[PDB]
Design a binder for this molecule. Structure first.
Ligand SMILES: NC(=O)c1ccc[n+]([C@@H]2O[C@H](COP(=O)([O-])OP(=O)(O)OC[C@H]3O[C@@H](n4cnc5c(N)ncnc54)[C@H](O)[C@@H]3O)[C@@H](O)[C@H]2O)c1
Ligand SMILES: NC(=O)c1ccc[n+]([C@@H]2O[C@H](COP(=O)([O-])OP(=O)(O)OC[C@H]3O[C@@H](n4cnc5c(N)ncnc54)[C@H](O)[C@@H]3O)[C@@H](O)[C@H]2O)c1
Ligand SMILES: NC(=O)c1ccc[n+]([C@@H]2O[C@H](COP(=O)([O-])OP(=O)(O)OC[C@H]3O[C@@H](n4cnc5c(N)ncnc54)[C@H](O)[C@@H]3O)[C@@H](O)[C@H]2O)c1
Ligand SMILES: NC(=O)c1ccc[n+]([C@@H]2O[C@H](COP(=O)([O-])OP(=O)(O)OC[C@H]3O[C@@H](n4cnc5c(N)ncnc54)[C@H](O)[C@@H]3O)[C@@H](O)[C@H]2O)c1
Ligand SMILES: Nc1ncnc2[nH]cnc12
Ligand SMILES: Nc1ncnc2[nH]cnc12
Ligand SMILES: [K+]
Ligand SMILES: [K+]
Ligand SMILES: [K+]
Ligand SMILES: [K+]
Lengths: 463, 462, 461, 462
């Protein structure tokens, strides 16, 4: 529109291209678009003012415009420095939506962008809803703008790491507003986290290095939802995949799924010494992928022992899964192309351009699927963002900020969406594939003790 | 010396069974680690356990583990076709009352169960129940409620059995507390899924020796058993289509690379032949039911199936397939035990060279156990370690010695704590030679767990 | 009163007949050959010496040959591969057959002799069907005069073809032969997909071991090694592959397998020191697939992880040094064709000894020894090639040719690709597949007839 | 600097290309092993090679291996979309004449091949040819047959080019001997299959970022490229159907777990819309042509495909798909380079929010090279080690200098000896850390081979 400058993107001329890709993505997101069409007439989010912090991809564009189509105002930023698709951010800004995001931000630019959503015209925006991915915006609000939380009705957190931070604040009494855990919807956790990484991990590695994967040796650290999806991403390409875990139930699943379970440390004991590193094992690894959400699971001693020219990447939320700090202090970095670096283990000052003793680090340790590719595909993010919309509507309509203190105390929690809504999202996803769900006969529904409409499983069911 | 309190097919198979039990013990490290750890403590001394579960080699290692920990048992199988006779023989030969053989009649099945409940014509002084499917539990509540006054708890193996317990509980008709063994992760996401992955194609190959690559399969259900069964067939190279009523499970099937379809047009089962997607069913070479529901492969579906298609059921009960319709209308030709050609040409007789027949396996009973040996020992290790832990817990709680006011406060259906689930998993991983990494204190602090676990909140779905 | 046979138990015939009727519905290419050649009786006057695993599938092959006019006399080419109900049904039909499951070496030799001799004198045989070359060898060495009446040999398997080619090179082969093995609808169907189906099948029936999560070493990656490797990997085994052929080793790499050697740096010097004891100490299962000699040797057997399974799916048992195990280690029979080999010695064994290996079928081909071999729908391809090869060599009548015309025909050849394609189409139709027909322009564009053959003879598929 | 005998998109991308060249060298052990082995001998001293093959990073390593062995070259790409611009830049910057860029026109493509043939308006004194698809070979035979008098041979990369050579050989129009590089096992059974397995789903993801799991694909053809393409999609969770005209290849698709279908009712392509299986084609989300044939995805098939289906080709030439019909009848909307929405609602104009469109990748050109980067270095290593050995053998044979009677005995289309195929394979295996076992003397004697090989008869199909 004419006069709109309340944004900061890399190249506004990319908007036409981004619009072409948003129009394709709408065709790939039936659950999310079905909610857009379902709630359009009602406008369940009229009056919502949403602070959003999540990877500014084409898929997030569809989510953003869905929220706007339901009545909300939003101010947006990405939750990672390398995850933004610049044509997505351009198309959103061209639509008149405040978005501060580009691919390749510095740490300072990243913090600047979140603050640009928090502040409008040099004063705290009168926001009343928060959509977060990783909890960085939630942390800035609680630590730097706590008075704004007196007007916010709730937070809808996208990812595992963010939910852990919320539960930590709830346990310490420091969480100021209720939240919905979007991550643990089955149409999110067991779809986004697992199948998303199956699609996008080997995608990112091929775009970054164009390395053949078949026949090579991989070590996946972690076998949660992301580790499961990451392991399959590599194994389906023909890699020989070994899996590390601290959780023996997950380790049991890796074994039964056909993976050898190993540890980087002798007998799994990480005493911090070089002698504890299984140097024979790590000397045969061509690719190491961290998937834990933990800290320093690919440490300095492991990086020193890795086979020459191995690829190192992280698909967990934060870069501290790999001890990149050590590599910056001790090893020379040679940039191949954006988000692909050769780390030369021959010393800090300078490198031989034909040196063979280097490692290849992708996205400088940041989420590799979004950093070196485009993250999850639209048809997978459909489930996650459908949940986001439902979670926004529910928390906004509850109107926590307006309740009396006694009613607040009953509502101050971290909850998940009801299974029935989970099932309804899954149903639209299945129809997108052309799948046909069978309806129970009344006699059958009575036999197993469920309604014909569902829910079909008890809340304890793990799928 | 003069042990006669048993009924098996052939006691002379005992030596063979002992040889296979010794092998199975090396495949079951978690169960044997329990046997080693608790042998001296004798935590089941005084326990008198009525056991009703498939009398396989694997159940034999379970039985002898309970006996090793101090228990007395009386045992029957929970399916007429699932017993391995050499395993029943080795257990009888060791002086353990067992009433089980492959190929029981329905009457013999009920009689075997009663032989565990009655000793010398009187009710045995049982105080513990181990059940698989809830048949023994039902007979106890229905025909012997006085025995339940002395029983400290039930440990239920399987999905169908847990559902029947939860129905009794909401109806106020459950008399003793139960432990839901099924919903240990080292049971449900191990036994139910991976076990059927191993044993479904196994049983189909033993029954028919049919090539599976390139042929078309329809799996009804995509719960844990349906997941495992679908993989059992897809890894053989079948083109597998999946049916579901649960849209979340259907979503998983699509993402796992399967076409999700319905036997009925637009998914609507109106009971008429016109509802049958006859085009789809006419292309199916193999159908497998996995639901725990009733009549999910109904008469109209059986009428529409491709000639010479194979029909089998791997859920707990045979009413998933309308076998009664087939007994009533079609002529049965036995190829060999637990393999029948069912001739759709009529009831009275059949032409030996008729081409319009179906092949039914295990007369619609659990096919992995009926036509093969069920799950392998190293998978049943997880399930049966959980059973031993469940039996110790309920026996040590001594529910039946509580006043009526306290019984009411502890009458429930619970699962084992996650810490025990993890410890069973550790011994399973070690059995494969896997090495679990230990968290550093700062790593445990960072994700908010103890170094030793539990590593996941109770909400985690794995 | 037919008595010209010997089987385990003739009362199994009705059961075998029931399974033959099912097998026919799984073998459309073979049954199609019955319908196509029935009226013409192209093997009328043929008298076939047959030596191949007496399975239900072989039963349908036998009766297909008879339906086309032939008389046969049958034995099995392995001591453990007979299905007794199949042999029973063949006998009951009035067909001379000498085969049962669990023959001794002596009885095996006696069974071949019974097919060769009728009433104490050599049968007037004129055709040979063989699987592995044992019948071929006995005729060439013990009854060379019968070969003057025989029009040809149709040899099933890689080991047999290799023996034939040595005799051809050495000028000792008497009659022409058809390499049935190297039809694509045989080698790239039977040897590969067949073992994919039947290797894990046999391991499950013998041991009921979980395979998922365990470590396997497959020795060899030819057609059998390729299918065997896939049989285990699809169950979830972590499979390592050994090879002497770098091209085959390259395929294993690209297929997602780690390529390893039992010997350090791949050099086998015959000493325990050459053994990669750390590799072997992790292996839960080893399978030999080479057709070579002693590829699972004594030093490898000493070094295997306790309680590993050892088995062979090549044609002969000498792939595994079972001789060494019979000499030094105590054998405990678990059940027929399943033995625990106690590495503690030969002076008895502790029934609870933990240091043993499990050997299947005493090293004989394990898919047939501990299960039922390949499924009917796979053997359909192989045995359609066998019938066509029988007709091709029989209609040529080499034994009646003038001497000055025999040299042109004394060879070992494969069937023409047109026959290979004809068998393949019938298999594809068995699966409900629909083959696209080229338009004339498309056929012109790629330079083939619309009728085929569709590939040059150089093509490898 | 001073040197202007090239044309690339952007010479300033050279340092980037050089960085990726250095990485590729570490991924190409067989190609670099020939570089080291023959560097001292200079076996291509005097060779002047015209090269026409996709100007990628992998081709760069091939080009610099030839130069390192003493050759001079003049290079162009064999496809308008397959060049990597940073690779062409690094080559031109190394002083090597190269005429290639991503996104040429058909005129510029021909012009590039002409600029290698001609130096300063006159024909270069070439004596060797390296070709991929036969376009350069065709241009020499038709338009510069005088240059062939002094050329010692052709090394053809791909199946389509070998076919064109064998036609010329049969007709007697082939002027110089050729080596079929394609049919080395370390080429056909590595490049053609495994390469497409890697790069087909890679290209589609880069073009569309479409989820592939759970969607329906139809692969036209099941040769080596079809086999790899089918696996590329199946391994991602697609439901893959396979079409074929060759029953043997069709039998392989069945046994590999694929449903084999024809786009035509009963497989009869009579040229009418009635012959189209509209039901089948209405369910397909992605079609991929792999045939090397013409019009195997015709106009009626395109009219019948599901809305928003993806259409691409990974055969050598774009005429596998009838893109001519689409240019004449439908409106093309460019999403981004090499990605077009083809709106089936008319020829002139389109609604930006129209839903009846197909997505065509690379305008029908080879999708793996057009929308991604083709095969990975470690795979092209095998193909390009064969190319070097092939060039060495034909250049040293010096055909163009041989007596007429010798010319006649050597004018053929031949493959490399199996011993060299094995030697290439061995270096690829060592590149993976694989360990090849050495036969003992007795074992080699038992199977009738040298301990050094070759290990298989020439008839072996692997
Ligand atoms: N990049 C993406 O597209 C994407 C998508 C979803 C989530 N995520 C992020 O990925 C991370 C993992 O998420 P998740 O859903 O898989 O969580 P999860 O809890 O399901 O899995 C993490 C696993 O790591 C294991 N682990 C922890 N410390 C370990 C160590 N030192 N060594 C080995 N294993 C260890 C734990 O046992 C656990 O099973 C989170 O930070 C989440 O926010 C990323
Ligand atoms: N044979 C074995 O070894 C074995 C092992 C474990 C459990 N079981 C039995 O198998 C059954 C299933 O066990 P589970 O743990 O997988 O249960 P589950 O609840 O996880 O799965 C059953 C599935 O069937 C689906 N379903 C229900 N009705 C349906 C219908 N009409 N059509 C299609 N799908 C339908 C449900 O939505 C559900 O996902 C139970 O009877 C259980 O006792 C057998
Ligand atoms: N059991 C069955 O159902 C069945 C079916 C077909 C063939 N076979 C038999 O299996 C054997 C193999 O047949 P094939 O078609 O695979 O032959 P093949 O030539 O295609 O493969 C054998 C492979 O073994 C490799 N090899 C040889 N010695 C080796 C060693 N010491 N270490 C490692 N690798 C070694 C060779 O390089 C070759 O690639 C033959 O004896 C054949 O008759 C058995
Ligand atoms: N893009 C790449 O990276 C790449 C790599 C190698 C080869 N190629 C090219 O791909 C093409 C195929 O090469 P190839 O080695 O697989 O050849 P191939 O001969 O091995 O395979 C082609 C197959 O197509 C089948 N076919 C022909 N017409 C058909 C039709 N109308 N319908 C269905 N199937 C039909 C044939 O029967 C044959 O099996 C050639 O043009 C080749 O140059 C591309
Ligand atoms: N494409 C994507 N868009 C937004 N959030 C994501 N998380 C993972 N992939 C994503
Ligand atoms: N082998 C087995 N033994 C006992 N119960 C089982 N359930 C499934 N397989 C079993
Ligand atoms: K994306
Ligand atoms: K079992
Ligand atoms: K069989
Ligand atoms: K590349």
């Amino acid at each position: 529109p004419a006069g709109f400058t309340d944004y900061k993107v890399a190249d506004i001329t990319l908007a036409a291209w981004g619009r072409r890709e948003l129009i394709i993505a709408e065709s790939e997101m039936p659950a999310l678009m079905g909610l857009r069409r379902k709630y359009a007439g009602q406008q369940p989010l009229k009056g919502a003012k949403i602070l959003g912090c999540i990877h500014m991809t084409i898929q997030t564009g569809v989510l953003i415009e869905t929220l706007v189509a339901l009545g909300a105002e939003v101010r947006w930023s990405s939750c990672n420095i390398f995850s933004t698709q610049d044509q997505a951010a351009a198309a959103i800004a061209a639509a008149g939506i405040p978005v501060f995001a580009w691919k390749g931000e510095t740490e300072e630019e990243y913090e600047w962008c979140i603050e640009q959503t928090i502040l409008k015209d040099g004063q705290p925006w009168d926001a009343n809803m928060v959509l977060d991915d990783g909890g960085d915006l939630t942390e800035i609000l609680h630590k730097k703008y706590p008075q704004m939380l007196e007007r916010i009705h709730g937070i809808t957190e996208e990812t595992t790491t963010g939910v852990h931070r919320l539960l930590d604040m709830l346990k310490n009494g420091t969480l100021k507003v209720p939240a919905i855990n979007v991550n643990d919807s089955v149409t999110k956790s067991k779809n986004d986290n697992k199948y998303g990484c199956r699609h996008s991990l080997n995608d990112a590695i091929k775009r970054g290095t164009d390395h053949l994967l078949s026949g090579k040796q991989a070590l996946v650290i972690g076998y949660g939802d992301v580790g499961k999806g990451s392991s399959q991403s590599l194994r389906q390409e023909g890699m020989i995949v070994k899996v590390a875990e601290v959780d023996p139930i997950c380790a049991m699943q890796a074994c039964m799924d056909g993976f050898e379970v190993v540890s980087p440390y002798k007998n799994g004991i990480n005493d911090g010494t070089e002698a504890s590193i299984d140097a024979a094992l790590l000397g045969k690894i061509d690719l190491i992928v961290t998937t834990t959400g933990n800290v320093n699971v690919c440490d300095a001693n492991m990086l020193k022992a890795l086979k020459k020219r191995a690829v190192v990447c992280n698909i967990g939320h934060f870069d501290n899964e790999i001890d990149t700090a050590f590599m910056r202090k001790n090893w020379a970095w040679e940039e191949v192309k954006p988000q692909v670096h050769k780390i030369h283990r021959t010393g800090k000052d300078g490198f031989d351009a034909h040196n063979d003793d280097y490692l290849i680090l992708l996205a400088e340790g940041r989420l590799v699927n979004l950093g070196n590719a485009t993250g999850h595909p639209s048809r997978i993010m459909d489930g996650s963002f459908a949940n986001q919309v439902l979670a926004q509507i529910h928390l906004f309509e509850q109107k926590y900020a307006d309740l009396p203190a006694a009613e607040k105390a009953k509502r101050l929690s971290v909850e998940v969406l009801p299974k029935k809504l989970d099932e309804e999202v899954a149903l639209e996803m299945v129809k997108g594939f052309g799948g046909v769900v069978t309806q129970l006969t009344p006699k059958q529904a009575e036999y197993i003790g469920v309604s014909v409409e569902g829910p079909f499983k008890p809340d304890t069911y793990r799928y």
